[PDB]
RNA sequence: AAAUAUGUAAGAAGUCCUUGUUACUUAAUUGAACGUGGACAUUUGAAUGAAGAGCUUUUAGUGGGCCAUUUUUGGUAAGC
RNA sequence: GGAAUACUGCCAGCUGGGACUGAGGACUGCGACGUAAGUCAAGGAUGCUGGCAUAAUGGUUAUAUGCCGCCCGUCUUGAAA
RNA sequence: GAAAUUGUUGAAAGGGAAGGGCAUUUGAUCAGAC
């Protein structure tokens, strides 16, 4: 018959790594996790206590409560036509700080800095971000770069 | 053909022209649809919309909330206008003098404010005193106090008041409601 | 009540563009450009005529 | 209160000055449109005469016409077609060329024909088929005051000024283009030029990027 | 007589009519599932600040 | 369609590490501007580590040949796909211009080997500057001295549907 | 180790500065959470669009499906 | 070395022929030409003329011709069956 | 004193069904308007 357990179809998903098996480095435990920190959930096969479900591998969440050795995470889960709020308890081995939020914070610092310097002269610093614009004109010169003409090649078997 | 991004011929979903066949309410609406059209004041927009509303969207404001309303900072002189019904609260033994504008007062409320030095007025008299709703405040009664709302949404693990005719012991207070008898909820 | 079109009905055109009168009277649609006598470099012509 | 010549003489004076102001900016755009159109022409001579190649600026604006009907379109192209407001066959919209807009254009390539439009094509479109979105209502422009009361915030006062913000993609192009209702074009007058439409323009069909041949196609539609 | 066993066909299209949007985000979320030891502390700390501010703003 | 010869020059996009790229050039026979640029990207990707997104086109210039009146004899090499394999070929077309020779080649391949535009590579088109350097008979035939021939059995096209005398094919 | 798919973020519920509470925590007014006071407003923090947005109650029919390109399993195959 | 022509594109360049439509119903608005008066092709047709004033047009109905049109209701993935 | 169904008279059409739709010719009949 059919077989739907907790770790069904997780063969390669919780497979450890290439050449990284064994005890985990202690930067994973030295970390400090606050309420409201944005985290991603990558499991660790060695640590069996406090593993998440397969459904949350690679899913990013936010910390709501913190415990002695583990951490609670808020996850929104698509079921039906909606998002149902899901709460997970995870040891800090299967949780790592989401770096996605981080580059926005460094953007705020420059964004706050540029406005502060701009108001001294009022130049409309244009703090927004722009997408990649179409290129503008240029002059390409042929000193020592004279064009060389290429032609289609005939057929050969090479075997 | 067209690829519609939204449903076609969708009515607004809001109520205009209240469905009651009371002639007097229609006159009140007519006075305030003219007023909201030609005064450019947000107060007459509210009252005209409120005159549309249904009975459960007009919960009965009691004289106690009015008293609490007048005990707000700098509101004891504002005219109180209730688009709905005003009932009596025998749970308070004092009362201010402020006048009230409403559709219907109860006899106990009509006796109450009149005894306390006030004077209960209708909505048209409000218009000829406050065409732009000057020095007024809208009081809305508690909508979620009706016994039907307690039953809305019931399912497992939310405690939402089962529909029941006869209550007490041995009426759905059994397996499903305790861990001693099966699961609980 | 009725959409009249520019690009015709000259009266409607002048309504939307005060510059149409002087654009036409000056014949800016058939204006002439001053001649220039510059010629391409020798490297350009050989490349264009290259095999 | 005679009120038949006092304010009427006031409104006529306020009309004449607006016609007056509209006049220089039309004249102003003319030397601006002439000068640039002659710079690239002349900068090409200088490159060839100096043994170099003048690589012109990449086009900043494309006109997009929906080519396919409304049936049988997968979810992703249908959503992108809606975000450009092309919800029926032979509809037109100006799109600002940018990385975030190029990837939209690739997803919709089997369903649209687009290219780089010239002044003549854009000027004719707004004059004949230009409608403004006026309080969620499709209103023929037909007057400068209609644009004035709706795009006067950004310095746009006329139908000719509106065309200026389109062709030279200005700081207020987003609002200006959004104000312009999507263009309802007819079928081309001389035909589509090909026996089968739904092949790429490079493959003898109709859809895809036809870099300047959109002008011929839109003019037959317009 | 045999029948169809299971398909997900038309299930995603039903899900986009009244679609799958993120529900909401409220400020001051619930405290369900929080360490009780920190929660008892929170009440006592909360009362102290409220009473202290009440005396200052009497 | 009716073909035009363009030269297309493109290069990889400049960068700080390697500015001033090599500016490769290639001659393309195509109906219009857009196809000429496309075929350049098609063929260039077959030689170099480049594509349309990772490079730029610098110039395009249509090449119309010097003598649209002098009659030439062109040797043409191609590379085309059959239903079973890829084959090289060499032929002559004798005509007045280079583009009309290619326009003949595509029809000629489509008629003899059912080779459509997609499955044909034009390797190079060159003039045979010397007579008696022609190796195929069908073009060597017309190079004789004082060539002359009739056109027997001429068929007149009639405008009206009915003719009142039996037509004659003298010529 | 792709492609196509898939989670999160792109602000005012933000950022920065000072210090009040506590029965938790620390050798330690050390921290943790919540607040008090002050500063930063329309390029306020990518694109495009928005046809209004968010919410509730109740109730119908349906709960035999089938076909096409692409992916794919059993079968020699099949309008299986 | 000097021109022309082709091709492509532009003109708020001029002009001839045909077809369909005439919604709206005092003025207001925007314009154009004029020193002014005023005029206009400017927020939707008017002027002149002819025949008939009757079954002539038109309606109905029967037939003829051209083209098209499978039997309804029901179960059903699927009905002219 | 209905319909199915039938007789008589009158009109019309009919080369292996009939009935229907758009459009008009033809025949019969007819309202309005003046």
Curated annotation (Swiss-Prot), chain A:
Cellular location(s): Cytoplasm
Primary residence: cytoplasm
Sample GO molecular function, one term: structural constituent of ribosome
Record carries keyword Ribosomal protein: yes
Keywords, comma-separated and alphabetical: Cytoplasm, Isopeptide bond, Ribonucleoprotein, Ribosomal protein, Ubl conjugation
Positions of crosslink type Glycyl lysine isopeptide (Lys-Gly) (interchain with G-Cter in ubiquitin): 31
One Gene Ontology biological process: cytoplasmic translation
Gene Ontology CC, one term: cytosol
PROSITE patterns hit by this protein: RIBOSOMAL_L21E
InterPro entries the record matches: Ribosomal_eL21 (IPR001147), Ribosomal_eL21_CS (IPR018259), Ribosomal_eL21_sf (IPR036948), Translation_prot_SH3-like_sf (IPR008991)
Record's miscellaneous remark: There are 2 genes for eL21 in yeast.
Subunit structure: Component of the large ribosomal subunit (LSU). Mature yeast ribosomes consist of a small (40S) and a large (60S) subunit. The 40S small subunit contains 1 molecule of ribosomal RNA (18S rRNA) and 33 different proteins (encoded by 57 genes). The large 60S subunit contains 3 rRNA molecules (25S, 5.8S and 5S rRNA) and 46 different proteins (encoded by 81 genes).
PANTHER family documented for this protein: 60S RIBOSOMAL PROTEIN L21
Function: Component of the ribosome, a large ribonucleoprotein complex responsible for the synthesis of proteins in the cell. The small ribosomal subunit (SSU) binds messenger RNAs (mRNAs) and translates the encoded message by selecting cognate aminoacyl-transfer RNA (tRNA) molecules. The large subunit (LSU) contains the ribosomal catalytic site termed the peptidyl transferase center (PTC), which catalyzes the formation of peptide bonds, thereby polymerizing the amino acids delivered by tRNAs into a polypeptide chain.
Swiss-Prot record, chain B:
Task of the protein: Component of the ribosome, a large ribonucleoprotein complex responsible for the synthesis of proteins in the cell. The small ribosomal subunit (SSU) binds messenger RNAs (mRNAs) and translates the encoded message by selecting cognate aminoacyl-transfer RNA (tRNA) molecules. The large subunit (LSU) contains the ribosomal catalytic site termed the peptidyl transferase center (PTC), which catalyzes the formation of peptide bonds, thereby polymerizing the amino acids delivered by tRNAs into a polypeptide chain.
Miscellaneous comment: There are 2 genes for eL18 in yeast.
Family, as annotated: Belongs to the eukaryotic ribosomal protein eL18 family.
GO biological process: cytoplasmic translation
Subunit and interaction comment: Component of the large ribosomal subunit (LSU). Mature yeast ribosomes consist of a small (40S) and a large (60S) subunit. The 40S small subunit contains 1 molecule of ribosomal RNA (18S rRNA) and 33 different proteins (encoded by 57 genes). The large 60S subunit contains 3 rRNA molecules (25S, 5.8S and 5S rRNA) and 46 different proteins (encoded by 81 genes). eL18 interacts with NAP1.
Organism placement in taxonomy: Eukaryota, Fungi, Dikarya, Ascomycota, Saccharomycotina
Record localization: Cytoplasm
Protein name: Large ribosomal subunit protein eL18A
Record PTM N6,N6,N6-trimethyllysine, positions in chain: 49
Keyword tags: Cytoplasm, Isopeptide bond, Methylation, Ribonucleoprotein, Ribosomal protein, Ubl conjugation
Gene: RPL18A
A GO molecular function held by the record: RNA binding
Position(s), cross-link Glycyl lysine isopeptide (Lys-Gly) (interchain with G-Cter in ubiquitin): 115
Name of a matching Pfam family: Ribosomal_L18
From Swiss-Prot, chain C:
Effect of substituting residue 3 to A: Significantly diminished nuclear localization
Protein modification: N-terminally acetylated by acetyltransferase NatA.
Reported effect, residue 21 to E: Leads to an inefficient release from ACL4 with a delayed assembly into the 60S subunit
Reported function: Component of the ribosome, a large ribonucleoprotein complex responsible for the synthesis of proteins in the cell. The small ribosomal subunit (SSU) binds messenger RNAs (mRNAs) and translates the encoded message by selecting cognate aminoacyl-transfer RNA (tRNA) molecules. The large subunit (LSU) contains the ribosomal catalytic site termed the peptidyl transferase center (PTC), which catalyzes the formation of peptide bonds, thereby polymerizing the amino acids delivered by tRNAs into a polypeptide chain.
Family of the protein in this entry: Belongs to the universal ribosomal protein uL4 family.
Miscellaneous: There are 2 genes for uL4 in yeast.
Name of this protein: Large ribosomal subunit protein uL4A
Segment of the intact protein contained: 312 to 362 of 362
From Swiss-Prot, chain F:
Pfam families in UniProt: Ribosomal_L18A
Source species, domain of life: Eukaryota
Crosslink feature (Glycyl lysine isopeptide (Lys-Gly) (interchain with G-Cter in ubiquitin)) location: 124, 130, 148
One of the record's GO cellular component terms: cytosolic large ribosomal subunit
Record carries keyword Ubl conjugation: yes
Coiled coil feature spans: none
Compartment(s) where it occurs, according to its Swiss-Prot or TrEMBL record: Cytoplasm
Modification sites for Phosphoserine: 31
InterPro entries hit by this protein: Ribosomal_eL20 (IPR028877), Ribosomal_eL20_dom (IPR023573), Ribosomal_eL20_eukaryotes (IPR021138)
Gene Ontology molecular-function annotations: structural constituent of ribosome
Biological process (GO), any one: cytoplasmic translation
Key word Oxidoreductase present: no
Keywords assigned by UniProt, alphabetized: Cytoplasm, Isopeptide bond, Phosphoprotein, Ribonucleoprotein, Ribosomal protein, Ubl conjugation
Main location: cytoplasm
Subunit and partners: Component of the large ribosomal subunit (LSU). Mature yeast ribosomes consist of a small (40S) and a large (60S) subunit. The 40S small subunit contains 1 molecule of ribosomal RNA (18S rRNA) and 33 different proteins (encoded by 57 genes). The large 60S subunit contains 3 rRNA molecules (25S, 5.8S and 5S rRNA) and 46 different proteins (encoded by 81 genes). eL20 forms multiple interactions with RNA and proteins in the central protuberance, connecting components of core functional centers that are located far apart.
Misc: Present with 54300 molecules/cell in log phase SD medium. There are 2 genes for eL20 in yeast.
Family of this protein: Belongs to the eukaryotic ribosomal protein eL20 family.
Name the record gives this protein: Large ribosomal subunit protein eL20A
Organism of derivation: Saccharomyces cerevisiae (strain ATCC 204508 / S288c)
């Amino acid at each position: 018959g059919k077989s739907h357990g907790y770790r069904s179809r997780t063969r390669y998903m919780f497979q450890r790594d290439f050449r990284k098996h064994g005890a985990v480095h202690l930067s994973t435990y030295l970390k400090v996790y606050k309420v409201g920190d944005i985290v991603d959930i990558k499991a660790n096969g060695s640590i069996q206590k406090g593993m998440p479900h397969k459904f949350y591998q690679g899913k990013t969440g936010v910390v709501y409560n913190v415990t002695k050795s583990s951490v609670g995470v808020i996850i929104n889960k698509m079921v039906g036509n909606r998002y149902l709020e899901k709460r997970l308890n995870l040891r800090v081995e299967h949780i790592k700080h989401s770096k996605c939020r981080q580059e926005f914070l460094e953007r705020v610092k420059a964004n706050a800095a540029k406005r502060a310097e701009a108001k001294a002269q009022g130049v409309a610093v244009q703090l927004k971000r722009q997408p990649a614009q179409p290129r503008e004109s240029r002059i390409v010169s042929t000193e020592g770069n004279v064009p060389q003409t290429l032609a289609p090649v005939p057929y050969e078997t090479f075997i | 053909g067209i690829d519609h991004t939204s449903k076609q011929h969708k009515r607004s979903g809001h109520r205009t022209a209240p469905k009651s066949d009371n002639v007097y309410l229609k006159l009140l609406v007519k006075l305030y649809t003219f007023l909201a059209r030609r005064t450019d004041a947000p107060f007459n927009k509210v009252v005209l919309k409120a005159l549309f509303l249904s009975k459960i969207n007009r919960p009965p404001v009691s004289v106690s909330r009015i008293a609490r309303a007048l005990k707000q900072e700098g509101a004891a002189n504002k005219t109180v206008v209730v688009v709905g019904t005003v009932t009596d609260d025998a749970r308070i033994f004092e009362f201010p003098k402020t006048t009230v504008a409403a559709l219907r007062f109860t006899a106990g409320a009509r006796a109450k404010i009149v005894k306390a030095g006030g004077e209960c007025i209708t909505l048209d008299q409000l218009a000829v005193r406050a065409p732009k709703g000057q020095n007024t405040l809208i009081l809305r009664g508690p909508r979620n106090s009706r016994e039907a709302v307690r039953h809305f949404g019931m399912g497992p693990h939310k405690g939402k008041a089962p529909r029941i005719l006869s209550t007490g012991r041995k009426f759905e207070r059994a397996r499903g409601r305790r861990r001693s008898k099966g699961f609980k909820v | 009540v009725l959409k009249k079109n520019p690009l015709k009905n000259k009266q409607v055109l002048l309504r939307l563009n005060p510059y149409a009168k002087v654009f036409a009277a000056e014949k800016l649609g058939s204006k002439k450009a001053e001649k220039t006598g510059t010629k391409p470099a020798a490297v350009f012509t050989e490349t264009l005529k290259h095999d | 209160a005679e009120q038949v010549a006092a304010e009427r003489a006031a409104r006529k004076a306020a009309n004449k000055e607006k016609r007056a102001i509209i006049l220089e900016r039309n004249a102003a755009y003319q030397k601006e449109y002439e000068t640039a159109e002659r710079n690239i022409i002349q900068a090409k001579r200088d490159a060839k005469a100096a043994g170099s190649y003048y690589v012109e600026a990449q086009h900043k604006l494309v006109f997009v016409v929906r080519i396919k009907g409304i049936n049988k379109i997968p979810p992703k192209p249908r959503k992108v077609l809606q975000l450009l407001r092309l919800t029926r066959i032979n509809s037109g919209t100006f799109v600002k060329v940018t990385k975030a807009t190029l990837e939209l254009l690739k997803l919709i390539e089997p369903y649209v024909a687009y290219g780089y439009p010239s002044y003549s094509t854009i000027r004719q479109l707004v004059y004949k088929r230009g409608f403004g979105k006026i309080n969620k209502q499709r209103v023929p422009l037909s007057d400068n005051a209609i644009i004035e009361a709706n795009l006067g915030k950004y310095g746009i006062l006329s139908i000719d000024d509106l065309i200026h913000e389109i062709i030279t993609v200005g700081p207020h192009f987003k609002q200006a283009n959004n104000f312009l209702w999507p263009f309802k074009l007819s079928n081309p007058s001389g035909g589509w030029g090909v026996p089968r439409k739904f092949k790429h323009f490079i493959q003898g069909g109709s859809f895809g990027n036809r870099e300047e041949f959109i002008n011929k196609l839109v003019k037959s539609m317009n | 007589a045999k029948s169809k066993n299971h398909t997900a066909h038309n299930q995603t299209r039903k899900a986009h009519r009244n679609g799958i949007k993120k529900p909401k985000t409220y400020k001051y979320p619930s405290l369900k599932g929080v360490d009780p030891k920190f929660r008892r502390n929170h009440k006592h700390a909360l009362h102290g600040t409220a009473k202290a501010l009440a005396a200052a703003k009497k | 369609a009716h073909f035009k010869e363009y030269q297309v020059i493109g290069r990889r996009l400049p960068t700080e590490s390697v500015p001033e790229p090599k500016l490769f050039r290639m001659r393309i026979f195509a109906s219009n501007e857009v196809i000429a640029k496309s075929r350049y990207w098609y063929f260039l990707q077959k030689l170099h580590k480049v594509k349309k997104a990772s490079g730029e086109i610098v110039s395009i210039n249509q090449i119309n040949e010097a003598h649209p009146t002098k009659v030439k004899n062109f040797g043409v090499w191609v590379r085309y796909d059959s239903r079973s394999g890829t084959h090289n070929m060499y032929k002559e077309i004798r005509d007045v211009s280079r583009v009309a020779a290619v326009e003949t080649l595509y029809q000629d391949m489509a008629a003899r080997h059912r080779a459509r535009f997609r499955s044909i590579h034009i390797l190079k088109v060159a003039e045979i500057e010397k007579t008696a350097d022609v190796k195929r008979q069908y073009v060597k035939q017309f190079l004789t001295k004082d060539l002359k021939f009739p056109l027997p059995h001429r068929v007149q096209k009639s405008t009206k549907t009915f003719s009142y005398k039996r037509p004659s094919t003298f010529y």
